[PDB]
Amino acid sequence: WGYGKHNGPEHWHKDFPIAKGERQSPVDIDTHTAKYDPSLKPLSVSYDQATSLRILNNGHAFNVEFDDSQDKAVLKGGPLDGTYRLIQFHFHWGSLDGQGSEHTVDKKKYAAELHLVHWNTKYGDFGKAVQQPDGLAVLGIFLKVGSAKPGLQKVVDVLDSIKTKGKSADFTNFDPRGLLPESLDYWTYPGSLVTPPLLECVTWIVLKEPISVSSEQVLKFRKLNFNGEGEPEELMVDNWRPAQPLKNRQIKASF
Numbered sequence: 001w002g003y004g005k006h007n008g009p010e011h012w013h014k015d016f017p018i019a020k021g022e023r024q025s026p027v028d029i030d031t032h033t034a035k036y037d038p039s040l041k042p043l044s045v046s047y048d049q050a051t052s053l054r055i056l057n058n059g060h061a062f063n064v065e066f067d068d069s070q071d072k073a074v075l076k077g078g079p080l081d082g083t084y085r086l087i088q089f090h091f092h093w094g095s096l097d098g099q100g101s102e103h104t105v106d107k108k109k110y111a112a113e114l115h116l117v118h119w120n121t122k123y124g125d126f127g128k129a130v131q132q133p134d135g136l137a138v139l140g141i142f143l144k145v146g147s148a149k150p151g152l153q154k155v156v157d158v159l160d161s162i163k164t165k166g167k168s169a170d171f172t173n174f175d176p177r178g179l180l181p182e183s184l185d186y187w188t189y190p191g192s193l194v195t196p197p198l199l200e201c202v203t204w205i206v207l208k209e210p211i212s213v214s215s216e217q218v219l220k221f222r223k224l225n226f227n228g229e230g231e232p233e234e235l236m237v238d239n240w241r242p243a244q245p246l247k248n249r250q251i252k253a254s255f
């Protein structure tokens with residue numbers, strides 16, 4: 001599987017039948033249709049104690065991994081029940097500024113989208129969590145081209161080091177708080193992972209307010225390779241999936 005012409009998203013259903021399931025992601029967020037839910041509690045993001053370990057290129061993106069052996073970086077409140085632990089964060093981007101995000105707002109596409117992946121600690125390990133309907137909680141944040149995001153530069157500068165698939169580099173003392181927008185207003189719905197196994201275990205939390213990055217920042221993203229070292233170079237661009245049918249599901253708003 002990949003994002004090419006012959007292994008792209010339109011082909012995933014052959015290996016992952018769940019691809020045409022009932023609670024597939026990403027989706028278009030219709031802001032006129034979204035339901036203002038007053039019973040929705042404020043998000044609780046506790047990342048002061050976050051411990052970043054490394055960064056790796058897994059051939060479909062780059063993942064910043066965290067120490068999830070303890071309740072160090074957690075997400076709670078909002079639509080969630082219990083505590084979710086941050087395990088990694090990554091992005092989906094485009095070849096142009098006009099595309100890249102997974103989720104769309106009123107059909108509008110952003111330059112990229114940041115996914116903060118958390119797993120429900122009642123299940124003991126990520127592996128068990130991915131087997132539950134309430135297994136994961138993913139924080140999605142839109143990225144728009146404008147002014148530079150200072151907080152994101154440490155990640156941009158390390159990309160040289162993990163240009164190809166399978167490369168990883170030590171990445172300690174990275175503070176994820178630098179990537180958050182000012183407001184934590186959000187939309188939420190029941191969905192799935194946006195890449196294979198495309199397991200329908202995620203509670204989606206998409207922030208309303210996008211963060212801005214400079215053209216130079218997002219450009220460095222586009223210099224990445226899908227391919228392994230000493231293979232024909234394939235730039236890592238457009239690692240996003242077409243929006244899926246909401247199919248009855250309802251998108252709730254905290255605002």
Ligand SMILES: [Zn+2]
Nearest residue numbers: 090092115194
């Ligand atoms: Zn993602």
